Task: inverse folding
DNA sequence: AAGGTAGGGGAGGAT
DNA sequence: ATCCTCCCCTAC
């Protein structure tokens, strides 16, 4: 019986069962019920010494148990690490038991189910029908999965059904309340297994007069009296509010594969559930496949706290309590956890997601025609835009002008759209689907048929936009890949973080290598150091800077050093420089480099002067294999990215390989996390120490290197930086570049992984040829092992402000002088989400002007600082008196949470008082907008005493009164410091602050 | 809501109260308990204080100098001695008052201290006085035991205790110089008696009365002389021939007195002590007076030795021998010497058995290069001579060859001793 | 004793001065839901909803919080049973009797113990049901519990499955204990020692301990 | 159920 | 002045 697995879920009744939802080639849905067991791992001595007999058990083989606790010694009398080998058993218990000596108790029971039965969560098995027992229509019970899922066949595709929904509720002057405010519209996008899409909107007829309803029907609307007259193939249906909700529950109770909403767990489904209960005695009832449970829809809350002590909560999500084998997926929490925005709102997400560049095809008097095709933008951008233009009502031009669509014509390859736009002095414009331009609160005061039909168009768009975002972010591909990578149900892929998702492959490794990890002592954490960060040699370079970055440093450091809790031989410490030397001489003979690596760390205790960790590299440990698994997966998705040609395939595969980078890096992080099963203080700090040494090695050999007439001379001797090695060390290496090349290399910065290597040329084509040559020689002759670097880009017009703040123009390694460089901002106010939109515009203007004057080169006297400072004051004073810039340019966004000491923090106070009075509630993980607002009847203030007293939170209906203005003093002070810190004059800058602000400036 | 959680709270409650005298090994445990208390209940009524000093003054009163009159009551009198004051708490180390630190005391003394505190748990901490490298137990601070039973037990276990007096007083008893003299002569103790303390039956609070005079003296020289095994004490000598008693080196170092100056002295009936109203000078001048080959061993003075095989055998409590190879057989005859020979490295043993200080000796070794062949020191030198300016460091540096000779010898015996 | 006017039954609330600075929101909140809530039969009757508001908060140290009042025979007073014939109070009295030795009694009422304020998180439920009005009291229950929390030092909740996220509902940290409700299987209420834990925590917070035996009436 | 350190810039306070 | 602490957010 060929089936493809769709989902796994657990019941929660008196008995616990695990259900599989899978679909046959022909579309038939089959549910299989499995018994749910508790899993325990015990030794043979324990297995035979249990008074209550076990229900079932199977041998696990002969596993080695290693005590991976860490101790320090002051001499070399190190004893063997306590280890034993014994027969192990895996015990299955229908009911929870407590066994005095049961190990591997940090693993989930669902993980044991998958692994000890050979089941892949997303496999496509050909099930053996002699074990399945029919218990209901299309539902089987399986008492033996080991002999049922034995055979897997190649993957095949299946149909899936979807429901996308949105609602609109009456709004007076407050957030809609289920006790007062009726629902006006409900829209669905109904997709069945056949692929047929039905788009329809329901209109509440009880808000229209008899004449308005009569015209609605005569103008082509259906008017249904009850649920049994509903027709899903009609675009518009009018009915009473009770019918609206009875249709809503008839659809929600269906066994869809996905029911997809945007922030509908807190509002959409919550309103429908509560409003129905108030009006009629009806419930939304879910049933299990075998009809042994029935539960009512009731949205519940799951909180996320921080990992510290007195800390509070820092996020919250809402979940559906269904038991019918349906995934109620909510885009709101998904995007917030996997996206970077100033705010996570449906309009802001679309504004960034669905955009393209279009050309003006034909100008008019009250219309402007745009054309978009593969000839105006990157391949696939015109197609993505054209798809959303089908339902879209407004198109935004250059992120500023919101135009209403007058005509639309979708072309075979692109689109033509006619917008209501004033004449603009250009030909090429950015189009995106962003914020609309309507006031619903007023439309509910003059409510009529034409408004009711106007709203219907917006509601169906919001229901379809969920589908376009669903495909845009490739949710289905990410879900299946995650379920296979971490062996867990598809429904749980996006709920868990590192501490849990690492345990899937970890359990496989422990069982394949036959290892048990145990502890007997108390864990104590100490601080340890981090990566090596260089200070910038200059600020503005005006030269090409080559970036040579280690492919994957820390994961490869842990593999090279075989850094794992069970591989450490020991830590030797000394209190004085007499015994330190004795220990060093003995270590060089007891632990020969060919088998051991010696890592010279910084002491953890202040009374120690030396701390040396010895790792045995002969037998590969558990962490190196865990890292190899995640590194291999990332390489596979990077390879597929190279073959992605559309605009959505590239984004999806780039996201996939990024995720695996973070997971492999989390494997490192969990080693320094005190509450991790993998915690190892010595191993985590040894990884960092080796990392620092590799950065210093690469920087040294490159800094001072000279490319000459047919050969490259490295600055230092190319020796192994850790131990004595048999590789060549001659710093002279033959090159394949023309003998006419005569260059010198320097090093201007570097942080943990990459080295910024400066060359004395400005051409961006010779820089690529030379950099590629360095890449070959460095990987083959400078580096000595599994470490490799990649050439990523040529930075041009690099300007650095501080160690971790710089901007540049990026010419990628795979480009040339005929390509357009990217604009890169790292760490600066241009990318920070807690600055402004006003600051960003001016800092870009003046920073560019400064770069151009210094690049051109004049240095008449002190003109550079004088012209910039005088111009800055003009603009700052002009805005203060003109006050023409809208408030939306001076708003900041900040995340709410309760992670404060002394709970009376101004941030908790501001939000708490907001929540108590404003109908809009800010949740514990929500980002809110705020601004600094002051009375309009006060002068320019030079001496600022209290800032926290001007903060206010901006809601959806926040309009300044005649007695309010923007607190320009705080916005201007921050901008001025950022601009003036760029200058290199010690007299004009200081006098500038004294005149404009009267404050003491800070410089870096 | 479990009994385990109740226990952890009671442990925090007991240790929160038992502060200011149990600071040897307690702060790390206290920090753990309060971090647990807040983690499992979200709030705890403690401030996580980590800078707790040592101070037991809440158990005592101010010093009474005036001739006051307390006529009724049952009193126990103790001849409080002159010296540095230490306390010893339950399962803790010896700690000095005023500045919390750790001290090494003889193992026989610490064992007896544990025996009386294990015999009965009604004692919060013991009180000790130190003078001339002699430990005496004075007055145990308790809730359930009168100042009688600790003296009976301490004597049996082997601790020094004063003779105490008990009397029920009904007749007029005015405190004055006359009564002070009568009382102090009635205890039959030999150690210098600085004051007399009394406790009233039924009250735990201590009171102390001190009758003393002042004397104006002129110091001519300060000498250093031996009391024990390479342990010396200062003796301040005035132009009249009289001596001013000093308990330790710290007193003269902090008082900033110099030879050929006038000082105030606290005069008692049988002795007098220097009254308290720039560090290198006072240390070097006292040493110069008695000889260059002396250093300051923390609390005491110690002379430079002439260390060799004979001294090593005397400190390891084994028979004298002439060849270093004889040590292996003279150490395995008993089972009691091994305790200090096998349990510590060569560096530590050679420091303690030759008379080197702790803080200053590490400072010297951490500024010194060594040439070591086959785990034997053959050469050394100094990287930064600015560490040698301290008189204590120069004295041990100039004789460092003695450390090297023994250091190699101790390595040799371990090679075959194991 | 002041009062406010309510648009629906009981048409008035009488309260102690200590509750005055939350009455403004309580009136607005109740007047939003009373027209829906009062359509059915409730436990207790509407005139008993706001009966614990006639209670000073300045002499309270520990709060004993339930989830809702008895499905039947409610008096408005949490945990109160005029005949001591309800499972919840039986186990509450039994557990403390084991600790104190007081076994000869006719009843046990938490409202007479010094420093104890018993409280029902939800002020009412549907007659014969439990947790049935969670939607009606959501706004009010949050406000009232926070007001008590600002006064007491130790919040004692009954039910680990119901108060697991109580930390999310309070802005003022309180020394929270969550135990078992005195109604579940396996007699898990009487296996806790929360009565002594509370007094130990109070001593750590420099507060007078509670003599829990004061609740016994004979 | 809960990954790690390095570092800049800003607000408020205790001197 | 003048440094210290806390925090928000970013680079790895
Ligand atoms: N969350 C993160 C991030 C980084 N890092 C650390 O920063 C090092 C360099 O960061 P990186 O160069 O951006 O990441 P990478 O491993 O080199 O991957 P690459 O892009 O293929 O070169 C990483 O090796 C460490 O993983 C850490 O700890 N956690
Ligand atoms: Mg890298």
Result:
């Amino acid at each position: 019986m060929d089936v493809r697995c769709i989902n796994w879920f657990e019941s929660h009744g008196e008995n616990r069962f695990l259900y599989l939802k899978s679909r046959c080639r022909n579309g038939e849905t089959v549910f299989i019920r499995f018994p749910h067991y508790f899993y325990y791992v015990v030794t043979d001595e324990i297995y035979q010494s249990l008074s209550p007999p076990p229900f079932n058990a199977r041998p696990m083989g002969k596993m080695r148990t290693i005590d991976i606790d860490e101790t320090i010694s002051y001499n070399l009398d190190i004893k063997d690490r306590k280890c034993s080998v014994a027969d192990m058993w895996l015990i299955e218990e229908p009911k929870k038991r407590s066994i005095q000596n049961a190990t591997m108790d940090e693993f989930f029971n669902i993980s044991w189910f998958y692994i000890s039965n050979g089941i892949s969560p997303d496999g496509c098995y050909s099930l053996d029908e002699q074990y399945l027992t029919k218990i209901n229509n299309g539902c089987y019970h399986c008492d033996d999965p080991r002999n049922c899922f034995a055979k897997e066949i190649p993957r095949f595709d299946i149909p899936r059904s979807y429901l996308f929904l949105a609602i609109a509720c009456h709004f007076d002057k407050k957030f809609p309340s289920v006790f007062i405010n009726p629902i006006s519209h409900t829209s669905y996008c109904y997709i069945d297994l056949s692929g047929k899409r039905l788009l329809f909107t329901l209109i509440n007829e009880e808000m229209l007069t008899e004449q308005e309803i009569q015209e609605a029907v005569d103008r082509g609307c259906l008017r249904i009296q009850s649920l049994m007259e509903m027709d899903y193939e009609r675009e518009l249906v009018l009915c009473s509010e009770i019918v609206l909700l009875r249709i809503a529950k008839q659809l929600l109770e269906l066994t869809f594969d996905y029911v997809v909403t945007f922030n509908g767990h807190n509002f959409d489904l919550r309103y429908i559930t509560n409003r129905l209960e108030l009006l009629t005695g009806e419930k939304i009832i879910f049933r299990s496949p075998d009809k042994k449970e029935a539960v009512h829809l009731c949205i519940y809350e799951r909180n996320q706290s921080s990992h510290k002590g007195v800390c509070g909560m820092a996020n919250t999500t809402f979940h559906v309590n269904n038991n019918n084998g349906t995934i109620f997926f909510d885009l709101y929490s998904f995007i917030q956890k996997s996206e970077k925005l100033d705010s996570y709102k449906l309009d802001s997400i679309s504004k960034n997601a669905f955009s393209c560049m279009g050309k003006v095809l034909n100008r008019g008097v009250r219309e402007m025609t745009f054309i978009g095709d593969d000839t105006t933008d990157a391949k696939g951008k015109a197609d993505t835009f054209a798809k959303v233009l089908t339902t879209g009502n407004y198109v935004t031009v250059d992120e500023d002008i919101i135009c209403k669509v007058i005509r639309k014509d979708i072309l075979e390859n692109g689109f033509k759209v006619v917008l209501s736009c004033p004449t603009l002095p250009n030909d090429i414009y950015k189009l995106s689907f962003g914020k609309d331009d309507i006031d619903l609160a007023q439309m509910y005061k003059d409510y009529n048929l034409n408004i009711a039909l106007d709203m219907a168009r917006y509601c169906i768009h919001d229901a379809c936009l969920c589908q376009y975002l669903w495909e845009y972010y490739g949710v289905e591909t990410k879900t299946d890949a995650g379920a296979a990578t971490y062996v867990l149900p598809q429904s749980m892929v996006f709920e868990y973080r590192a501490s849990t998702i690492i345990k899937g492959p970890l359990l496989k490794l422990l069982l394949e290598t036959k290892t048990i990890l145990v502890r007997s002592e108390t864990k104590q954490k100490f601080p340890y150091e981090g990566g090596k960060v260089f200070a910038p040699k200059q600020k503005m370079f005006s030269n090409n800077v080559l970036i040579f970055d280690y492919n994957s440093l820390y994961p490869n450091v842990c593999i090279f050093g075989n850094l794992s809790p069970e591989t450490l031989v020991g830590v030797v410490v000394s209190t004085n420089r007499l015994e330190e030397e004795i220990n060093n001489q003995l270590l060089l003979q007891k632990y020969p480099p060919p088998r051991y690596i010696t890592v010279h760390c910084e002491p953890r205790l202040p009374n120690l002067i030396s701390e040396i960790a010895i790792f045995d590299r002969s037998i590969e440990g558990t962490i190196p294999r865990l890292l190899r698994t995640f590194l291999a997966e990332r390489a596979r998705y990077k390879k597929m990215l190279k073959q992605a040609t559309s605009s959505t395939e590239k984004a999806i595969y780039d996201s996939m390989q990024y995720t695996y980078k973070i997971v492999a890096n989390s494997v490192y992080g969990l080693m320094g996390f005190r509450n991790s099963a993998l915690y190892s203080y010595a191993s985590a700090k040894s990884c960092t120490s080796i990392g620092r040494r590799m950065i210093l090695y690469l920087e040294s050999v490159l800094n001072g290197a000279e490319l000459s007439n047919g050969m490259l001379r490295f600055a230092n001797t190319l020796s192994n930086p850790f131990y004595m090695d048999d590789r060549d060390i001659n710093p002279i290496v033959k090159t394949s570049l023309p003998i006419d090349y005569r260059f010198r290399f320097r090093s201007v910065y570097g942080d943990t992984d990459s080295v910024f290597t400066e060359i004395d040329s400005q051409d961006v084509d010779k820089s690529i040829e030379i950099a590629k040559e360095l890449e070959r020689l460095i990987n083959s002759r400078v580096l000595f092992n599994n470490f490799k670097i990649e050439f990523e880009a040529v930075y041009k017009n690099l300007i650095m402000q501080s160690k971790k703040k710089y901007t540049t123009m990026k010419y990628s390694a795979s480009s040339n002088s005929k390509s357009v460089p990217e604009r890169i901002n790292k760490g600066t106010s241009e990318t920070r989400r807690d600055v402004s939109k006003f600051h960003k515009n001016m800092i870009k203007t003046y920073k560019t002007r400064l770069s151009e004057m210094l690049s051109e080169g004049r240095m008449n006297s002190n003109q550079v600082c004088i012209d910039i400072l005088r111009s800055l004051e003009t603009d700052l004073r002009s805005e203060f008196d003109s006050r023409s810039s809208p408030l939306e340019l001076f708003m900041l966004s900040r995340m709410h949470h309760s992670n404060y000491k002394s709970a009376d923090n101004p941030n908790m106070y501001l939000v708490t008082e907001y929540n108590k009075n404003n109908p809009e509630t800010i949740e514990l993980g929500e980002r809110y907008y705020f601004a600094y607002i002051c009375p309009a009847n006060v002068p320019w203030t030079k001496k600022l005493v209290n800032i926290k007293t001007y903060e206010t939170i901006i809601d959806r209906s926040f309009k300044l009164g005649s007695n309010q203005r923007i607190f320009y003093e705080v916005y201007f002070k921050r901008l001025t410091s950022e601009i003036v810190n760029l200058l290199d004059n010690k007299v004009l800058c200081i006098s500038f602050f004294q005149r404009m602000f009267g404050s003491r400036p800070t410089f870096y | 809501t479990s009994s385990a959680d109740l226990t952890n709270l009671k442990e925090l409650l007991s240790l929160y109260k038992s502060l200011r005298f149990s600071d040897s090994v307690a702060i790390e445990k206290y920090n753990s308990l309060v971090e647990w208390g807040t983690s499992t209940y979200w709030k705890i009524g403690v401030q996580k204080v980590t800078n707790v000093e040592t101070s037991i003054s809440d158990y005592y009163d101010e010093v009474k100098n005036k001739p006051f009159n307390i006529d009724p009551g049952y009193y126990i009198f103790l001849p409080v001695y002159f010296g540095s004051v230490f306390i010893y708490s339950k399962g803790k180390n010896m700690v000095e008052l005023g500045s919390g630190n750790s001290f090494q005391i003889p193992d026989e003394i610490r064992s007896a201290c544990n025996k009386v505190l294990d015999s009965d748990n009604g004692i919060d901490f013991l009180r000790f006085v130190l003078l001339n490298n002699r430990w005496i137990m004075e007055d145990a601070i308790s809730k359930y035991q009168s100042p009688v039973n600790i003296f009976k037990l301490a004597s049996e276990y082997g601790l020094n205790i004063p003779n105490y007096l008990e009397i029920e007083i009904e007749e007029d008893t005015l405190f004055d110089d006359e009564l002070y003299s009568i009382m102090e002569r009635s205890f039959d103790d030999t150690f210098p008696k600085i004051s007399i303390s009394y406790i009233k039956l039924g009250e735990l609070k201590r009171q102390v009365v001190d009758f003393f005079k002042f004397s104006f003296m002129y110091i001519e020289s300060i000498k250093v002389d031996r009391i024990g095994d390479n342990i010396f004490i200062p003796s301040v000598i005035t132009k009249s021939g009289k001596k001013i008693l000093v308990k330790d080196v710290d007193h003269l170092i902090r008082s900033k007195v110099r030879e050929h100056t006038f000082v105030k002295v606290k005069k008692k009936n049988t002795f007098s002590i220097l009254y308290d109203d720039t560090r290198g000078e006072v240390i070097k001048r006292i040493i110069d007076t008695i000889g260059r080959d002396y250093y300051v061993n923390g609390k005491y003075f110690s002379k430079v030795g002439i260390a060799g095989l004979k001294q090593l055998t005397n400190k390891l409590d084994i028979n004298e021998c002439a060849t270093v190879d004889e040590l292996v057989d003279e150490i395995n005859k008993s089972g009691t010497v091994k305790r200090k020979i096998k349990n510590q490295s060569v560096f530590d043993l050679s420091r303690e058995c030759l008379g080197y200080p702790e803080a200053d000796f590490i400072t010297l070794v951490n500024n010194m290069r060594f040439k070591i062949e086959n785990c034997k020191v053959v050469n050394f030198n100094i990287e930064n001579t600015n560490c040698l300016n301290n008189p204590s460091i120069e004295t041990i540096y100039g004789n460092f060859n003695q450390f090297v000779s023994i250091f190699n010898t101790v390595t040799d015996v371990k090679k075959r001793l194991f | 004793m002041n009062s406010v006017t309510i648009s629906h039954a009981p048409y008035t609330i009488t309260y102690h001065d200590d509750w005055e600075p939350v009455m403004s929101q309580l009136v607005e909140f109740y007047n939003e839901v009373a027209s829906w809530l009062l359509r059915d039969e409730t436990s207790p009757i509407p005139d008993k909803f706001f009966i614990q508001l006639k209670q000073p908060l300045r002499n309270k140290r520990v709060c004993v919080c339930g989830i809702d009042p008895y499905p039947k025979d409610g008096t408005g007073v949490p945990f109160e049973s005029p005949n001591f014939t309800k499972k919840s109070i039986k186990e509450i009295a039994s557990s403390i009797s084991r600790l104190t030795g007081v076994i000869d009694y006719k009843g046990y009422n938490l409202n007479i113990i010094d420093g104890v304020i018993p409280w029902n998180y939800y002020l009412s439920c549907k007659l014969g049901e439990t947790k049935s009005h969670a939607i009606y009291w959501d706004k009010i229950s949050k406000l009232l519990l926070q007001h008590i929390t600002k006064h007491v030092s130790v919040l004692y909740c009954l039910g680990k499955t119901d108060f697991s996220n109580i930390r999310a509902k309070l802005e003022s940290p309180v020394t929270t204990i969550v135990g078992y409700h005195p109604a579940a299987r396996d007699h898990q209420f009487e296996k806790d020692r929360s009565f002594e834990i509370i007094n130990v925590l109070l001593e750590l917070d420099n507060k007078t301990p509670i003599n829990w035996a004061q609740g016994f009436i004979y």
Residues A 549-554, 661-662, 665, 668-669, 752-753 surround HF4 (ligand 1) (CB under 6 Å). The domain at 838-996 of chain A is CATH 1.10.132.60 (Topoisomerase I; Chain A, domain 4).
